[PDB]
């Protein structure tokens, strides 16, 4: 892919966070915390899991970022609707406004309904995403591996503004501490 040149730089929106989420500074990175982090609840926040969405929104255009993904056990990735449901149950699915990939159990599978297995010979350390509104079509890159394409939704109805979208998963297990980082341009 040539998608490099549509980087964006992506900063993560606190008020939608988690109350377990730990932002840093630079709002770069994204963590699960120990406990409570002592913020006061919102309708923004993300009520079930361990989600924060981007403040930036996009309603035209190509877009492309990266996410650091190292170490972790599990994760899930992409973007959504500004329109999404925070609270309560709910799947990662193109019908509930999501366009996502993850990693769970060591199985990476794409956001479908029902999920679709995805091929992955070199896990990734890092993932490039590219959004093409017009388009329709939000793609998945294994930056790992020479940057070989893991996923495309095309004829995607996007059906309003897109947020880029992050899920830093449960660490019931003690080896999914590690932090979701932005990487830099
Ligand atoms: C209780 C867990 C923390 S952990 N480390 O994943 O066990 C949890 C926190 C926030 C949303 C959903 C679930």
């Known amino acids: 892919h ?12 606190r008020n939608t966070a988690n109350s377990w989420l730990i932002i840093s500074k630079d709002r770069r990175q994204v963590r699960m ?13 993300f009520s079930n899991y361990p989600m924060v969405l981007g403040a930036q929104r996009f309603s035209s255009g190509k877009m492309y970022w990266e996410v650091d993904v190292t170490q972790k056990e599990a994760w899930d990735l992409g973007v959504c609707r500004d329109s999404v449901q925070r609270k309560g149950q709910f799947s990662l699915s193109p019908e509930n406004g999501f366009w996502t990939i993850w990693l769970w159990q060591d199985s990476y ?33 294994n930056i790992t591996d020479h940057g070989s394409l893991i996923y495309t939704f095309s004829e995607c109805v996007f059906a309003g503004p897109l947020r880029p979208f992050f899920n830093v998963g449960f660490n019931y297990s003690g080896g999914n501490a590690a932090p979701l980082k932005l990487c830099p341009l």
């Open 2 to 13: 040539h998608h490099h040149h549509h980087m964006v730089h992506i900063t993560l929106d």
């Open 33 to 45: 915390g120990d406990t409570h982090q002592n913020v006061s609840d919102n309708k923004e926040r």
């Open 109 to 141: 599978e794409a956001g479908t309904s029902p999920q679709t297995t995805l091929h992955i010979q070199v896990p990734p350390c890092q993932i490039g995403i590219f959004v093409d509104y017009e388009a329709g079509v939000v793609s998945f890159y």
